Amino acid sequence: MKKIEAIIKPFKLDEVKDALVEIGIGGMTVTEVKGFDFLPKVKIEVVVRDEDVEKVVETIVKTAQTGRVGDGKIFIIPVEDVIRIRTGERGEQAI
Amino acid sequence: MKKIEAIIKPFKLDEVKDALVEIGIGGMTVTEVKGFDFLPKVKIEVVVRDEDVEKVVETIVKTAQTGRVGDGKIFIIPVEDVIRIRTGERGEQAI
Amino acid sequence: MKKIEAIIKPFKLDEVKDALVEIGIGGMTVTEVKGFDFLPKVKIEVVVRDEDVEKVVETIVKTAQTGRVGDGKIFIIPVEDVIRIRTGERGEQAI
Numbered sequence A, B, C: 001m002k003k004i005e006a007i008i009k010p011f012k013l014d015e016v017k018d019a020l021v022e023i024g025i026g027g028m029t030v031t032e033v034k035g036f037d038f039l040p041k042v043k044i045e046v047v048v049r050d051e052d053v054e055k056v057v058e059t060i061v062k063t064a065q066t067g068r069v070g071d072g073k074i075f076i077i078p079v080e081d082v083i084r085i086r087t088g089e090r091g092e093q094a095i
């Protein structure tokens, strides 16, 4: 499993969220942040199975891209376990 | 060492914080976030020794759980080093 | 590549940002958070090449340190890939 953390322009959030839901993303966490003299940005975090990482990365790139400076970056971070709070399910059963 | 990132319902924050302090957690970072059409959630991050991860996970699950949809998830992420800013202490000496 | 996540006192943000830019940091993401009964803190995230991690850690420690309790902590988290949204560049080409 991997955590995909993407920092994008705020106005791109609904489009990116819609695109991710469309390819099957079940959950996502959004944080208001600032970055680069700081400009507002939106952080999106999604945790997915290893075999789904590339599709998510390409979907975020294609949907959040404007071609202008400041479009943002995506970081792929390893996740060793995932636990669903409601049920105690883990790993594959919790994504 | 591992970072435990948990996304929980906002009203569960004081209970979860109290439960974590009770089992010995020295520090925690809380961020206001939104998730799933987005609903407010609270992100808690705690970095702990490998041998303390399971106790923290079980404590968050038991305290944040309501049995209803939206209870949240917990992600376990590897941390290669930890540094205490005040002293420069690292690793085991900084947790 | 590694993600350096530092939680610091809010008033230290401009100094730390200036110090990081000075040693060559191209980008950084800042989040308003609370921590420890919670006090406001600022989270800074920077993703850098492995050979630049120590310089960044020392720069944050030296600039954010006051010697008083609450100065904060720095976590070093592995990053498996980085993607520049504007161009699709990855890894070394995206930092």
Ligand SMILES: Nc1ncnc2c1ncn2[C@@H]1O[C@H](COP(=O)(O)OP(=O)(O)OP(=O)(O)O)[C@@H](O)[C@H]1O
Pocket (backbone or CB within 6 Å): A007, A008, A034, A035, A036, A041, A068, A069, A070, A071, A072, A073, C026, C027, C028, C029, C030, C045, C046, C047, C048, C084, C085, C086, C087, C094, C095
């Ligand atoms: N190295 C980094 N570490 C942490 N956060 C970063 C880093 N680089 C970028 N970010 C985050 O991504 C946001 C958008 O950055 P940005 O789109 O400018 O990337 P870039 O390297 O400048 O490529 P571009 O030429 O398209 O601007 C930054 O404001 C910051 O929030």
Ligand SMILES: Nc1ncnc2c1ncn2[C@@H]1O[C@H](COP(=O)(O)OP(=O)(O)OP(=O)(O)O)[C@@H](O)[C@H]1O
Pocket (backbone or CB within 6 Å): A026, A027, A028, A029, A030, A045, A046, A047, A048, A084, A085, A086, A087, A094, A095, B007, B008, B034, B035, B036, B041, B068, B069, B070, B071, B072, B073
């Ligand atoms: N895959 C994910 N990636 C990133 N964040 C997630 C992911 N899944 C859940 N979250 C975060 O956890 C929050 C709560 O999710 P939630 O409790 O609905 O998990 P779930 O999979 O729906 O299980 P449940 O059936 O109990 O709802 C979401 O709003 C989001 O902020």
Ligand SMILES: Nc1ncnc2c1ncn2[C@@H]1O[C@H](COP(=O)(O)OP(=O)(O)OP(=O)(O)O)[C@@H](O)[C@H]1O
Pocket (backbone or CB within 6 Å): B026, B027, B028, B029, B030, B045, B046, B047, B048, B084, B085, B086, B087, B094, B095, C007, C008, C034, C035, C036, C041, C068, C069, C070, C071, C072, C073
């Ligand atoms: N173990 C931890 N897990 C997650 N976040 C932490 C942890 N420890 C500290 N933090 C974050 O760092 C912030 C500042 O902590 P702090 O400076 O008090 O570290 P410390 O261990 O108490 O060392 P000091 O004696 O200098 O206070 C905390 O408020 C919290 O936001």
Ligand SMILES: [Cl-]
Pocket (backbone or CB within 6 Å): A077, B077, C077
């Ligand atoms: Cl992380």
